[PDB]
PDB file of C-alpha atoms in Angstrom:
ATOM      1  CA  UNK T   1      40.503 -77.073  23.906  1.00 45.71           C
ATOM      2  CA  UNK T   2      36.824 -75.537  23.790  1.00 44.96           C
ATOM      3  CA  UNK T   3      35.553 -77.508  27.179  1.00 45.93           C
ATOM      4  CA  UNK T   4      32.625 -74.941  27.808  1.00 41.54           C
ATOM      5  CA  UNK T   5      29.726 -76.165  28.620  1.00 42.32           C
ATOM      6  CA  UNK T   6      27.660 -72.801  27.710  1.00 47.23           C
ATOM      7  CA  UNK T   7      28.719 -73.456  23.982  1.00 49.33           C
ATOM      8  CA  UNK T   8      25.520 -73.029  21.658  1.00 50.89           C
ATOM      9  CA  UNK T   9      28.064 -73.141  18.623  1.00 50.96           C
ATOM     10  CA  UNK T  10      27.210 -71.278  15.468  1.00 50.01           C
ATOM     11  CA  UNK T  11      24.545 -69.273  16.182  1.00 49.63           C
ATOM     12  CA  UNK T  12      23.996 -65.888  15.123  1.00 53.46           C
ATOM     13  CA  UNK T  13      24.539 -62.479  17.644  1.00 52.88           C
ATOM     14  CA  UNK T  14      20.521 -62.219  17.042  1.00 50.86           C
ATOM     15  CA  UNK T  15      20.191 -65.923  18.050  1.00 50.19           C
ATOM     16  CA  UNK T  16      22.119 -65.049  21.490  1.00 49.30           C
ATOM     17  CA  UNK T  17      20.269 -62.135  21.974  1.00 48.99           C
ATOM     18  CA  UNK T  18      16.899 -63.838  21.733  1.00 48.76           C
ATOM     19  CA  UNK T  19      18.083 -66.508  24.196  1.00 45.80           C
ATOM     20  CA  UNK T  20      19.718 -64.663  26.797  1.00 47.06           C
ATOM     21  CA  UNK T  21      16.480 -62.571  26.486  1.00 48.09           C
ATOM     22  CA  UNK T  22      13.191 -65.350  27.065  1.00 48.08           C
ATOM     23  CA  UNK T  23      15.788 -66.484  30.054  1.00 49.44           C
ATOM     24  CA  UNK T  24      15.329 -62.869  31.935  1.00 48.80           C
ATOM     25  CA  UNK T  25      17.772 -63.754  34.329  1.00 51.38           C
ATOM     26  CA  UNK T  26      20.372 -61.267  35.399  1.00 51.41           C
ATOM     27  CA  UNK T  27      24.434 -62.108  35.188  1.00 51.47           C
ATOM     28  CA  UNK T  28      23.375 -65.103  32.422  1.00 54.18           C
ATOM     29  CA  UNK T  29      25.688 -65.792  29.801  1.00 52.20           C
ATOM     30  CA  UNK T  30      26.446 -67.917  26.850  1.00 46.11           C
ATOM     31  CA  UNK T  31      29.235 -68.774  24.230  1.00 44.00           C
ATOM     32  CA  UNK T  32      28.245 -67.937  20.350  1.00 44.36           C
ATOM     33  CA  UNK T  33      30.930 -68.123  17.306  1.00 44.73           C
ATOM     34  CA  UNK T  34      31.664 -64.814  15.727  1.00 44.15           C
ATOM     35  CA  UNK T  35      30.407 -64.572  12.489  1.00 45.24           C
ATOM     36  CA  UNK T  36      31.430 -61.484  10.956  1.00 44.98           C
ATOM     37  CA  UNK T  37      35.299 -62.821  12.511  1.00 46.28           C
ATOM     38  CA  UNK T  38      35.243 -66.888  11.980  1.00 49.47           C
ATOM     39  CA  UNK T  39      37.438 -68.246  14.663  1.00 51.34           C
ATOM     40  CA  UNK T  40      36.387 -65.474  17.916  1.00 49.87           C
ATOM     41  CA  UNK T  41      34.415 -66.621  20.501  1.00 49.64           C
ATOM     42  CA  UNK T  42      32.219 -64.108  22.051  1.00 46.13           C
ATOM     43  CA  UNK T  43      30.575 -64.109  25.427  1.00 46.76           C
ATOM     44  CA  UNK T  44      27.091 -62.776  25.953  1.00 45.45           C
ATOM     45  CA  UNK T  45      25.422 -61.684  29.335  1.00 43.15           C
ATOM     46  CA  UNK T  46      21.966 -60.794  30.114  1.00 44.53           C
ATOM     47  CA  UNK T  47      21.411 -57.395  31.980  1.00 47.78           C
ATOM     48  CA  UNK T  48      18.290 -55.070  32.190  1.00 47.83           C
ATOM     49  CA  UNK T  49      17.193 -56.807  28.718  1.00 45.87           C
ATOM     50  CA  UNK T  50      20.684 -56.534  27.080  1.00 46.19           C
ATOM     51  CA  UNK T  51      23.058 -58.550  25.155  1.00 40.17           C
ATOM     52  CA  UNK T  52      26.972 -57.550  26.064  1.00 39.74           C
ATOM     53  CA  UNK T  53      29.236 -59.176  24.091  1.00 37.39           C
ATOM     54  CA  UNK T  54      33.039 -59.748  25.114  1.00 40.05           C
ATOM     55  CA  UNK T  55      35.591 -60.879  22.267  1.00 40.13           C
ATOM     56  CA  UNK T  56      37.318 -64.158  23.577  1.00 41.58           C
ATOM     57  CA  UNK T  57      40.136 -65.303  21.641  1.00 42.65           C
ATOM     58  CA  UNK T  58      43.201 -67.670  22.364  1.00 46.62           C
ATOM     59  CA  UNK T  59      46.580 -66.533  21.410  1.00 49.42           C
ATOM     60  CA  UNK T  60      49.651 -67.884  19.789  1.00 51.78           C
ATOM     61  CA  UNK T  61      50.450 -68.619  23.309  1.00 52.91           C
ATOM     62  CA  UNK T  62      47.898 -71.266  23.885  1.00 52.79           C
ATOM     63  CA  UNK T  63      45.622 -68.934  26.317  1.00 57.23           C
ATOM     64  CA  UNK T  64      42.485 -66.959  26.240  1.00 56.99           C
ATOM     65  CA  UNK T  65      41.968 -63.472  27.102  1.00 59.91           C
ATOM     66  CA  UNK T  66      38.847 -61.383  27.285  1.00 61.98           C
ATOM     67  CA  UNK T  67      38.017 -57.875  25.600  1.00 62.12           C
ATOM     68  CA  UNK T  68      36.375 -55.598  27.371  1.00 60.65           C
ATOM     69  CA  UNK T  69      36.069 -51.902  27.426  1.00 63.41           C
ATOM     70  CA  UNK T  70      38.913 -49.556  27.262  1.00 68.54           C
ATOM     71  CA  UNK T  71      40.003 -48.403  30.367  1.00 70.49           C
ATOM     72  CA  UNK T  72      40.513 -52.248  31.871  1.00 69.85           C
ATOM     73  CA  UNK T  73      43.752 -54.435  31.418  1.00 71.89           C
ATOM     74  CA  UNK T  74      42.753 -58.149  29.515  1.00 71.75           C
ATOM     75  CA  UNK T  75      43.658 -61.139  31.893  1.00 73.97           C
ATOM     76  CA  UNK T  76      45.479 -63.639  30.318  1.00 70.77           C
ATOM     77  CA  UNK T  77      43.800 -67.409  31.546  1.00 74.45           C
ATOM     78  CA  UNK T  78      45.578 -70.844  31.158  1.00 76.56           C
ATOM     79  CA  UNK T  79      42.282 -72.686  30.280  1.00 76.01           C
ATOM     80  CA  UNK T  80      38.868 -71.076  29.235  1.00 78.39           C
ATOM     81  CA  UNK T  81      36.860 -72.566  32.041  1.00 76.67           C
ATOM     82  CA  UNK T  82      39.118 -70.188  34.322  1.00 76.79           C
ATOM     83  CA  UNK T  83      37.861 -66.954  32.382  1.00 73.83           C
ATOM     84  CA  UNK T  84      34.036 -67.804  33.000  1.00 74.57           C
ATOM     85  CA  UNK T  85      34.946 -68.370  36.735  1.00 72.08           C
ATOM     86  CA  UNK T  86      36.829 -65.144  36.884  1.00 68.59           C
ATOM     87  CA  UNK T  87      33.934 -63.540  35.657  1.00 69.25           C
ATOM     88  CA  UNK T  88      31.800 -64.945  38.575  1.00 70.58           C
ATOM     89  CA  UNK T  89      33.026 -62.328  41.021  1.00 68.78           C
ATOM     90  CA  UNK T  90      32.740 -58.505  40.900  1.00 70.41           C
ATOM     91  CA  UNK T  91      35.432 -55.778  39.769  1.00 71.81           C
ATOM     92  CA  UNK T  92      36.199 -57.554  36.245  1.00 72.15           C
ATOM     93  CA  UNK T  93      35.824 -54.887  33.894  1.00 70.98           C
ATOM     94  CA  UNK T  94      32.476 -55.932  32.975  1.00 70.06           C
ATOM     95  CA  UNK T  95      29.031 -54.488  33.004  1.00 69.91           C
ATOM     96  CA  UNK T  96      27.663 -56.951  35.554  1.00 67.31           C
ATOM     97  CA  UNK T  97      29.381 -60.512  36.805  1.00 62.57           C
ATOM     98  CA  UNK T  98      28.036 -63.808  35.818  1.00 61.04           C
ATOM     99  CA  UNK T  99      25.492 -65.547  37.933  1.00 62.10           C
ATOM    100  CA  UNK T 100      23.303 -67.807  35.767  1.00 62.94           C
ATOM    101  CA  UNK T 101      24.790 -70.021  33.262  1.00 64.88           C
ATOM    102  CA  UNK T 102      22.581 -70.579  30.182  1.00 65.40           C
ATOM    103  CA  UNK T 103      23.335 -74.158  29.990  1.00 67.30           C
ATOM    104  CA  UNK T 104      22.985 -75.784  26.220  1.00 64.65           C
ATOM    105  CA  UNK T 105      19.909 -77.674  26.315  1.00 66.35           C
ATOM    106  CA  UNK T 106      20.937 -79.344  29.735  1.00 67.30           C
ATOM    107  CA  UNK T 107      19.396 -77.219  32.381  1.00 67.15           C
TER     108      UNK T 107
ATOM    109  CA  UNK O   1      12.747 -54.378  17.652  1.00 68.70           C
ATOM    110  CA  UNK O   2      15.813 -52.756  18.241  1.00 71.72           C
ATOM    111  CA  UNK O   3      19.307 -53.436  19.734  1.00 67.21           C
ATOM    112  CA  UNK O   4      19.995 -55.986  22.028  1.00 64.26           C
ATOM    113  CA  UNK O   5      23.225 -56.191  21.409  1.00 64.64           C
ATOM    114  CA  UNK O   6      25.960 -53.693  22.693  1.00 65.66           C
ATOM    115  CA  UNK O   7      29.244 -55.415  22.795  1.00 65.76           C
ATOM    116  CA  UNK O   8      31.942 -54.690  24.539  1.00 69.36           C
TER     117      UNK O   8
END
């Protein structure tokens, strides 16, 4: 189900932050477990020294759409591993697309 | 020390 390979698993939104951060790498992003909501996935991404976080969730119908602003429609993906390569192009309803995976302690 | 985080 969760085949992401960016998946630092519990770690706190500081924890995230921090990483994405000593990276300083544009268009990074990662995968942390929401803490304040146990079960929500949320996807960080490193831009001008910030931390945006998406909420990623799967539905009842066994896919995972993204969160983004208001003003921008939520995709609905068959597998998780297609939302991260959506996000890899522009116009996505996101504050920059992703262009530098912050690999788990495998780079 | 501030905000790093914005959300979204």
């Amino acid at each position: 189900m969760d085949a992401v390979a960016v998946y630092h698993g519990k770690i706190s939104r500081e924890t995230g932050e921090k990483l994405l951060l000593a990276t300083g790498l544009d268009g990074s992003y990662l995968l942390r477990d929401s803490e304040s909501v146990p079960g929500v996935y949320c996807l960080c991404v490193l831009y001008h020294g910030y931390i945006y976080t998406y909420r990623v969730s799967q539905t009842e119908t066994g896919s995972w759409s993204a969160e983004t602003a208001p003003g921008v429609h939520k995709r609905y993906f068959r597998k998780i591993k297609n939302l991260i390569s959506a996000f890899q192009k522009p116009d996505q309803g996101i504050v920059i697309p992703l262009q530098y995976p912050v690999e788990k302690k495998s780079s | 020390r501030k905000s790093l985080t914005i959300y979204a």
